[PDB]
Amino acid sequence: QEDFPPRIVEHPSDLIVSKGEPATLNCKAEGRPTPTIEWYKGGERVETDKDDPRSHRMLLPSGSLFFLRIVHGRKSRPDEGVYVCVARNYLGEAVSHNASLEVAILRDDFRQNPSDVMVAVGEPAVMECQPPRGHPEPTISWKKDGSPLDDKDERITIRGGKLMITYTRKSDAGKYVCVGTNMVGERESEVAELTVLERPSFVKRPSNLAVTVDDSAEFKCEARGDPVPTVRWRKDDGELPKSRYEIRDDHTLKIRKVTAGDMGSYTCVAENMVGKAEASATLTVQEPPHFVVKPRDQVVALGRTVTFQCEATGNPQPAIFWRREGSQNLLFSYSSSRFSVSQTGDLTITNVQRSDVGYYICQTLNVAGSIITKAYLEVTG
Ligand SMILES: *[C@@H]1O[C@H](CO)[C@@H](O)[C@H](O)[C@H]1NC(C)=O
Structure with a gap:
């Protein structure tokens, strides 16, 4: 067929490339005779090995441009930029779409380091983080004592650059780090210890x-x-x-x-x-007991009512009981009879008879001590 002008078949695709590694910007074109390929970084001619065999850029017969290494420093930057290939034959010129050639970067120091948390058992726990500078943007992940942490637990939620524990368990205590990851590598942040304090x-x-x-x-x-x-x-x-x-x-x-x-x-x-x-x-x-009130000997006429006072004070309140001199029968605060003992300790004999004559013993006692005192009853006509 009669000779034809260039037509670009394949165009260069945008590329982000790791610090010091080869790169390839593909470019295929059709035309008779075979079109000669030239590369332009923002309009400026790119000096390849098919211009001077001392340059680290190699033009391939397949029309593609190969970079043997990427040059990025504080003084020089000749590889980073926007590229277009141009196909030129006997009659005609073809210009391709543009492509980017950016160096992948990932810095050391973090935009925000996780901080320590001192909480009580049950209190929620939050941790803030922002990765170190990097292109493409670094992805955030978390580690607890070396091992990587999961959102799997119902309480644990990792969103954006935050770590949230709804309620703290002692088991959540430990050393935590934030991980920033792009294509360049990994960067583990500053250790933020979490302590679960019990009241x-x-x-x-x-x-x-x-x-x-x-x-x-x-x-x-x-x-x-x-x-x-x-x-x-x-x-x-x-x-x-x-x-x-x-x-x-x-x-x-x-x-x-x-x-x-x-x-x-x-x-x-x-x-x-x-x-x-x-x-x-x-x-x-x-304290052992002491008598506040002691009974006094008294004479009561037949059939009348007599009361014998006995009041004591100790610590604890000491119990009181009576008994007639010769008897074994002890009288307490309530079968019933004419004899009665009040709550405070007083003995009361009602409708007295000549048999009631004699000494009546009052006895106070508590865990500490015990005291005794008596008083006579004289029954007369
Ligand atoms: C790259 O091509 C786009 C069109 O897609 C254009 O807007 C842009 O100006 C070109 N870039 C350069 C640096 O020439």
């Missing part, structure tokens, strides 16, 4: 104690929490007894040679940086 609480709390005079007293107290909580005893109404207290290694409070006045309430206090827990117990000093 203070009591494993074993104090028990209310009743202890008599001169005996020692013990109040047990064990606490938990992360970080390990400091444990310190209080005295709600004053201070601890100088030279009479001792805080053991187990955290238990001991008051030696107890004397009334110690009688009150003591508090165990557990405290850490995330919270504070308190627990109370009372100490009961037990």
